[PDB]
């Protein structure tokens, strides 16, 4: 019944709330399904300092529900706190999906060929070359050329 605690006006309880979510989210992934509609309030509020992290728990609960593109949507406006974590499983899934989206968008962009271009968010394209620097740092040479084949750019 921790969902009803989101009715409190002070955001200082909201930071503690998300701190409970991400810890018990493995078993309580289903417990956030009906609260999604209350998460919309925290994400859509600009005066809410934790919206950046609100999109993380939203993207996780959509990972449980089997939502892919819908988790990408919060992935974008989730801020720096989202792409700062390279640990464990959730980081590779989202960049595989985001680069799939990105590379089909880029095969489309090269077919314009120029003019009336689609808007390309700086976050979705910045994690591309940003995480490509991992292939330059680890010196792994087979993946380094693969990404450049994917974006077609």
């Amino acid at each position: 019944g921790i969902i009803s605690l989101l009715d409190e006006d002070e955001p200082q309880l909201k930071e503690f709330a998300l701190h409970k979510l991400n810890a018990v989210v493995n078993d309580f992934w289903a417990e956030i399904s009906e609260s999604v509609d209350k998460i919309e309030v925290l994400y859509e509020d600009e005066g809410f300092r934790s919206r950046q992290f609100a999109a993380l728990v939203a993207s996780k609960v959509f990972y449980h529900l089997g939502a892919f593109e819908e988790s990408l949507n919060y992935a974008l406006g989730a801020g720096d706190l989202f792409n700062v974590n390279d640990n464990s499983e959730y980081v590779e899934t989202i960049i595989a999906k985001c680069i799939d989206h990105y590379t089909k968008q880029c095969v489309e962009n090269a077919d314009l060929p120029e003019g009336e271009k689609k808007p390309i968010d700086q976050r979705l394209e910045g994690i591309v070359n940003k995480m490509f620097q991992r292939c330059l740092d680890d010196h792994k040479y087979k993946q380094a050329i693969g990404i450049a084949l994917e974006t077609r750019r």
């Binding site: 493995n26 078993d27 089997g66």
Partner: peptide, 13 residues
């Protein structure tokens, strides 16, 4: 062990 089990569960898909 249900936290471990659900980690395994969701991580299969």
């Amino acid at each position: 062990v249900r936290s471990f089990l659900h980690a395994r569960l969701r991580t299969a898909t």
